[PDB]
Amino acid sequence: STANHFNAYKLTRPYVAYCADCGMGHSCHSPAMIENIQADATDGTLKIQFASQIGLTKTDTHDHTKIRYAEGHDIAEAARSTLKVHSSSECTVTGTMGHFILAKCPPGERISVSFVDSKNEHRTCRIAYHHEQRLIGRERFTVRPHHGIELPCTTYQLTTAETSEEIDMHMPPDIPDRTILSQQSGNVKITVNGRTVRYSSSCGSQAVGTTTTDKTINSCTVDKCQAYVTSHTKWQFNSPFVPRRMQAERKGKVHIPFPLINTTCRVPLAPEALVRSGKREATLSLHPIHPTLLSYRTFGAERVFDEQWITAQTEVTIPVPVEGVEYQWGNHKPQRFVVA
């Protein structure tokens, strides 16, 4: 959920993942893999799944000094302002819950997500995400201030959760590698490790064993040491890049914080109008605004009626029948008239 979020943080330790685009050419086991871009909102605040613990505590302390994530040693810990959403510029961070970080970003088709608090020169990734502001109404801008807009809006939740729906984190697996232990081909050293390392050799009982216990290994393989990946008291969500080193599929639940509520919307009203009223037809002369989807629909018979995104200081002949038009040239009530 998101209420006493230490329990949801403290069920599993966070896990890092081999992303494919992570710093201009690299795929690597970053803690800044975008697990997904969850933007289910008319309000347009992206709740993207961080690869680390979204508000992850290194002792399970949900305090802004600890934005803890997947490191080599279990806490990739950093300063909680250290993230950076780079849509076209520094998108505003709105909060961190569980494994996801929610925030408003600038407009775009590709969003980068970075963390530098212990983050690797600001360890960052960059995915594609078509954050385009499809706002309601005719108008096309992010400006509340001249208060004319009172519309419905799909707002992202701004508080932490209680429980809305659980992403399942559990069952600490591994994913295939070659670099666990050390050995000269009959002289094997296996020590404590930052990941749950299975103990593998080329001959003998070395195949597995996710312990951090020191041992010498003979009668095996020089590259044959299979220091395996696993977990204990950890587990990723789904392992998108993320190899599945579980035997059985299972996890516990966690709520993506800020479940979206039906909020309002302040869209700006446009400039008012010009109505030249001649014979059988009206001319709507409008000056420009931020661009407006204006609709002139003739009310009456089989409906001669049009609508277009108008974007200049222009004039349109709304046809003025005996039935009349509906000139919604902007975000007012579109009320037309009769002949005169």
Binding site: D40, T154, L260
Partner: protein, 54 residues
């Protein structure tokens, strides 16, 4: 399914027959009230001295 499907779906209602519901302000002589009836012909607008059927 998406998690916002319960947050927001899309309705594809195949059409049945429909009923137009109306409301007539009546200046029924010196009576002056409003009646609001389903206009199917069965509802009797019990006016003050009126049994209207819209």
């Amino acid at each position: 399914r998406a998690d916002v499907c319960k947050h927001d779906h899309a309705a594809a209602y195949r059409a049945h027959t429909a009923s137009l519901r109306a409301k007539i302000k009546v200046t029924y002589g010196t009576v002056n009230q409003t009646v609001e009836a389903y206009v199917n012909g069965d509802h009797a607008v019990t006016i003050a001295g009126t049994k209207f059927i819209f």
